[PDB]
RNA sequence: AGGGGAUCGAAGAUGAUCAGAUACCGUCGUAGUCUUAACCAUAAACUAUGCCGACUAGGGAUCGGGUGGUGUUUUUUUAAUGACCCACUCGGCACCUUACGAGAAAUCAAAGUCUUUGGGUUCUGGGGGGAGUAUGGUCGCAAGGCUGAAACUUAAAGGAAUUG
């Protein structure tokens, strides 16, 4: 059974709320996976990497596992997960989960010509993280994701079809650099760009306009 | 958009002034403050009350504005709030927080504190900036009462008070319930000085 | 000591901007700060700008909307040569469809767009976008 | 703009002082100073052939320990003396 | 060895060299 | 964001700061988004019809929420005097 | 803050500034008309004199100088302009 | 020492939350409740668990104990309150300062006046 | 790495100051890090008070103190007298008591 | 090279300690410590942070200067002075709180306004040793200062922080 706690799960469940975009339009926040999984279903995950840490402890070694993971469709939803329990599956169980939360939005554009259905970026991006950052830049069609396996990977996940990209720092620490690659796309939907210039009036929050059909007990 | 008669009457004035809700902090003074009015000599700022009625309209004017009455919060860690937050929860919708907090009440659904409203009133963020913090990692408005050295960080639209206590924090309380009564609700018309006592918002003792 | 008048220009109105204002005072003005907000305005990236005459070098206040992610300047004014244009935008612009390089040439300062239509060149000046 | 100039006319200044720093270059000096033509066994050339002085048993580094079959070989066009490995398991029965 | 003594050290033996390449001026 | 031949592409056009007029994006998680009440003769609050205001995470961190809420609610009237355009 | 009008300052916030701060610079000295009625006529001061001004006829004094405003002769008057 | 554990501390907090109406004073009877209405595997953990129910309830029965809420306090609360009959009109007028009394004059109309001054 | 803003002690607007040699084991230490004590105690002391006043002529005397400043050298200062070592927190506090 | 040479005191000699004790501790105490005339040119010579210019955020103290007051205190007959109090403003030495922002972090109103990478300019570094060594030049009475290599060797040396 799901039994959603919070406003956001019990509207989402009631099918008074139909696509995440909605979410994203009002910065929902959001705490129940399950809203993400019946907002967009086609979500596949993907392990990325799996390494052992170690405490030192009072009485004891203490060598957990970290597992990084990435979830998306390949259609402009990504989301980047990070966990570490000590048991392998268990961190990915909760590291799917994490990701499945931080499922975030991609604006993808043109290259430089109206056609048929984006396939690059909107505009140039970088994203840091640690000593790492990754810069992602609009790329000609067929060019492909210029990116080594893991960050390809996120960035296929993510919906995109050519893009140019260029790191800088420490880059053999997976941790940071997907991570910098996730702020890099993350990035696209702050960038505000002439076609973004227009006012717009400003929708009212489905937490007031079906406000009854949410409530606790 | 202008009401009409709800400017700022003389009996209502005479309810601040004897609350000294116009008595604002000393040399102590944040820059994010035109609610001022002449520095009154040896160390007191005198606050416009016009201004700080306004503030109180709007305050109420957003506050009914939301469709469930009982998820608009009130807060007050502060004794001295405590017997009005719990005051202005009784008569209005608004759920009531008054003593300790609880941090966790606003992110960590598993709490058992756990509230999740759409809109917040403070008395002090000073001492309530536990809420104030709170309530901006997950999109909540804030309306605060504000002296002339409060933080005002995270909180949109502050009411000009006085935190010095007695009566002012009573005061603005009822003014706020009495106002979000009068508006789309269970009251009356013009002057109308309402049945329920102002003292009834007040520290008890000793 | 200031060495480029325009560079204070900018950076005040990008610094601006970035601190959420809606207006700069700028000090002191010039012919050429004027032409690239002349630019800038003409395309939307400031609103209305004033010139308060000080006897002397001028002030400026801009009124800026927040479309603005950076004007930057090109500190040595380097020579381009018509078809070097295309590497500076690149360099320098986030797309190809929107964005501004602006640049000093015989016939006016003007954004690159602009100075490919008239077909002429010159010195570079700095950028919107 | 901390520290190189960046002057229109600045372009000797910036050849210079690349060109100075350029001897940083562990690859660059070594090809200026002409290291392989000068010290170095060999010419600078790829392979060299040389005549088998003696056969050494070098005993190998730690943690390792090993008997690691060499050869001192005098270079032809040199006379430079040097010690030599003998790859793989026997072949040092293969030389003489 | 503490970084001055070392110091020291070869500054002891740079004067010892110095002398003795005087021997063969 | 439109494409080769008039259709409207790319889901999702963000709302903006009333203040600031840059995007509010998703991960902010401090923004806010204030819904006054238009009222009608002698009080009384018409509700579900407000005067709405959005504010981003970044302005109301830097405590410039209260300040620049006055000049904006009162430049459509809800405000009379409080604010100063000057200083 | 964040938004202001930095072409029509308040008098007061303008009049609290410094002189080359202000929005266009002027100075905040003055000039003044100075006389001892021993004598019939009215020579001009400079509010910073400097120079210790002595009067047109009788060598008496007016002001000596300071620091900054000149401190006029204790027995006196004087007007702005 | 005689400190108690949280399973009973915490078993006590359960019951008196839930079952305030039946439970006493009185330990005892206390006692025999715990059995019809709870589960517990030994009788040296009920008597325990039951003796600081009691022990709470007590201690409730002359003020609040932090912890422990069963609403029906919360409405004990808001039917306790009322006071006044004073206020704070009386008497004369209003004692303001200079400008206490600028600003009533500047932005509205007519207040009892009473001046003031105040110095170093 | 850098373990305070005062680094040793107390001293930025200068270049130097000047040695003081430490009460205890006699060891310079510049004047503005010395640490210091005002030694103030009555010449006579706790019991000897009332034995004072009793075999002396005068009505109760008046009685003098002895003030003395005192310069311990960091080692000296922590090996007995102010000291403790404090967490990285409290190291911030320069409140006396 | 003269003078001075109270004190403390490299060297040296001693008393103890110690397995030893060329030391730590105690004693004697040469040079020295001070000064003149000349050398020397180095210090963790430190904020381990080039200079000039712009912009970006809050607070209370303090040093200097100036402006404003039917402020306080000094008495004489009120003043004038002076010292003090409040507000402001330049320019200082610093601290506090924050961080939009920066960083590997510690932390930082600069170490910010940097992959959305250009205000002007000087200097230095390019893995660790080898080595500030060799050699030449030059300065110095000397001690030594400045300039300053390679062959060869090596997979790490190193920084910040975390848990033990
Ligand atoms: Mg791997
Ligand atoms: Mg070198
Ligand atoms: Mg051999
Ligand atoms: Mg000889
Ligand atoms: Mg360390
Ligand atoms: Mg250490
Ligand atoms: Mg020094
Ligand atoms: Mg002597
Ligand atoms: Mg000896
Ligand atoms: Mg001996
Ligand atoms: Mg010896
Ligand atoms: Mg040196
Ligand atoms: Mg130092
Ligand atoms: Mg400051
Ligand atoms: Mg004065
Ligand atoms: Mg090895
Ligand atoms: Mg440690
Ligand atoms: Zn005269
Ligand atoms: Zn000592």
């Not at chain 8, 078993?11 to 206390?30: G, H, M, V």
């Not at chain 9, 706790?46 to 310069?71: C, F, G, I, M, Q």
Request: proline share 5%; with cysteine.
């Amino acid at each position: 059974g799901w039994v959603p706690v919070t406003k956001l799960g019990r509207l989402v469940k009631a099918g008074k709320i139909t696509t995440i975009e909605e979410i994203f339009l009002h910065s929902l926040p959001v705490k129940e996976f399950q809203i993400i999984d019946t907002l967009l279903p086609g979500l596949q995950d993907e392990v990325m990497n799996i390494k052992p840490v170690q405490k030192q402890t009072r009485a004891g070694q203490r060598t957990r596992f970290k597992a990084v993971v990435v979830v998306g469709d390949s259609n402009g939803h990504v989301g980047l997960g990070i966990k570490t329990a000590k048991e392998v599956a268990g961190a990915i169980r909760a590291g799917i989960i994490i990701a499945k939360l931080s499922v975030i939005p991609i604006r993808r554009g043109y290259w430089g010509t109206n056609l048929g259905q984006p396939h690059s970026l909107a505009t140039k991006t970088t994203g840091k993280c640690g000593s790492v950052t990754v810069r992602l830049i609009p790329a000609p069609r067929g060019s492909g994701i210029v990116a080594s396996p893991a960050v390809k990977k996120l960035l296929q996940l993510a919906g995109v079809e050519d893009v140019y990209t260029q790191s800088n720092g420490k880059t053999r620490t997976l941790e940071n650099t997907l991570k910098a690659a996730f702020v890099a796309i993350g990035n696209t939907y702050g960038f505000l760009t002439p076609n973004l210039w227009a006012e717009q009036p400003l929708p009212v929050s489905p937490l007031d306009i079906y406000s009854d059909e949410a409530s606790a007990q | 958009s202008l009401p009409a008669t709800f400017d700022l009457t003389p009996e209502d004035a005479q309810l601040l002034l004897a609350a000294n809700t116009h008595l604002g902090a000393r040399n102590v003074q944040v820059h994010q403050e035109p609610y001022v009015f002449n520095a009154r000599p040896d160390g007191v700022h005198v606050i416009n009350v016009g201004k700080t009625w306004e503030k109180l309209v709007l305050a109420a004017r957003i506050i009914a504005a939301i469709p469930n009455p009982e998820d608009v919060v009130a807060i007050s860690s502060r004794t001295f709030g405590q017997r009005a937050v719990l005051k202005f929860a009784a008569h209005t919708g608004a759920t009531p927080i008054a003593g300790r907090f609880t941090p966790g009440s606003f992110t960590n659904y598993i709490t058992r504190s756990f509230k999740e409203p759409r809109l917040v009133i403070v008395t002090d963020p000073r001492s309530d900036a536990q809420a104030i913090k709170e309530a901006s990692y997950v999109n909540i408005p804030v309306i605060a009462l504000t002296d002339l050295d409060s933080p005002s960080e995270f909180v949109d639209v502050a009411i000009p008070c006085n935190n010095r206590g007695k009566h002012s924090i009573g005061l603005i309380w009822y003014l706020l319930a009495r106002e979000v009564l009068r508006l789309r609700g269970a009251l009356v018309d013009r002057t109308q000085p309402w049945s329920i006592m102002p003292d009834l918002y007040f520290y008890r003792d000793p | 000591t200031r060495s480029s008048v325009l560079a204070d220009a900018l950076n005040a109105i990008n610094n601006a901007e970035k601190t959420g204002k809606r207006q700069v005072l700028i000090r002191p003005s010039s012919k050429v700060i004027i032409k690239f907000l002349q630019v800038m305005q003409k395309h939307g990236y400031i609103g209305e700008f004033e010139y308060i005459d000080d006897h002397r070098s001028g002030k400026i206040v801009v009124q800026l909307n927040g479309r603005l992610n950076k004007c930057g300047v090109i500190s040595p004014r380097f020579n381009v040569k018509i078809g070097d244009i295309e590497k500076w935008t690149a360099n320098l612009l986030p797309a190809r469809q929107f964005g501004y390089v602006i640049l000093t040439t015989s016939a006016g300062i003007m954004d690159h767009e602009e100075a490919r239509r008239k077909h002429v060149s010159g010195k570079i000046l700095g950028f919107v976008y | 703009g901390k520290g190189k100039p960046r002057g229109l006319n600045s372009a000797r200044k910036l050849r210079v002082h690349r060109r100075n720093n350029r001897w940083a270059e562990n690859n660059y000096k070594k090809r200026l100073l002409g290291t392989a033509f000068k010290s170095s066994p060999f010419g600078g050339s790829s392979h060299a052939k040389g005549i088998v002085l003696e056969k050494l048993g070098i005993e190998s580094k730690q943690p390792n320990s090993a008997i690691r079959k060499c050869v001192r070989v005098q270079l032809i066009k040199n006379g430079k003396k040097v010690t030599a490995f003998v790859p793989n398991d026997g072949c040092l029965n293969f030389v003489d | 060895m503490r970084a001055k003594w070392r110091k020291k050290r070869t500054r002891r033996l740079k004067r010892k060299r110095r002398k003795v390449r005087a021997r063969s001026k | 964001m439109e494409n080769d031949k008039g259709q409207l592409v790319e889901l999702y056009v963000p709302r903006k700061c009333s203040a600031t007029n840059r995007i509010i994006k998703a991960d902010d998680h401090a923004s806010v988004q204030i819904n006054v009440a238009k009222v009608d003769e002698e009080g009384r609050a018409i509700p579900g019809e407000y005067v709405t205001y959005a504010l981003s995470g970044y302005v109301r961190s830097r405590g410039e929420s209260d300040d620049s809420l006055n000049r904006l609610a009162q430049n459509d009237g809800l405000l009379k005097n409080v604010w100063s355009y000057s200083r | 803050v964040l938004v202001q009008d930095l072409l029509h300052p308040t008098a007061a916030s303008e009049a609290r500034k410094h002189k080359l701060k202000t929005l266009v610079q002027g100075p905040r000295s003055y000039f003044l008309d100075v006389k001892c009625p021993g004598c019939l006529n009215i020579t001009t001061v400079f509010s910073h004199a400097q120079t210790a001004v002595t009067c047109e006829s009788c060598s008496t004094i007016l002001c000596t100088p300071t620091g900054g405003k000149a401190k006029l002769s204790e027995g006196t008057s004087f007007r702005r302009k | 020492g005689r400190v108690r554990t949280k399973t009973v501390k915490r078993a006590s907090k359960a019951l008196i939350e839930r079952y305030y109406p039946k439970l006493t004073l009185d330990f005892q009877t206390n006692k025999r409740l715990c059995d019809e209405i709870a589960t517990i595997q030994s009788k040296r953990l009920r008597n325990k668990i039951a003796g600081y129910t009691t022990h709470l309830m007590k201690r409730i029965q002359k003020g609040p104990v932090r912890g422990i809420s069963f609403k029906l306090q919360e409405e004990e609360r808001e039917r306790k309150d009322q006071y006044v009959p004073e206020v704070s009109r009386s008497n004369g007028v209003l004692n303001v300062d200079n400008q206490t009394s600028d600003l009533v004059k500047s932005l509205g109309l007519k207040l009892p006046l009473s001046v003031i001054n105040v110095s170093a | 790495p850098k373990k305070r803003a005062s680094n040793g002690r107390n001293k930025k607007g200068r270049g130097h100051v000047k040695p003081v040699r430490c009460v205890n084991c006699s060891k310079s230490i510049p004047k503005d890090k010395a640490i210091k004590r005002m030694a103030i105690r009555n010449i006579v002391e706790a019991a000897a008070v009332r034995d004072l006043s009793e075999a002396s002529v005068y009505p109760e005397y008046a009685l003098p103190k002895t003030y003395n400043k005192l310069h311990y050298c960091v080692s000296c200062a922590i090996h007995a007298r102010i000291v403790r070592v404090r967490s990285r927190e409290d190291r911030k506090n320069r409140a006396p008591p």
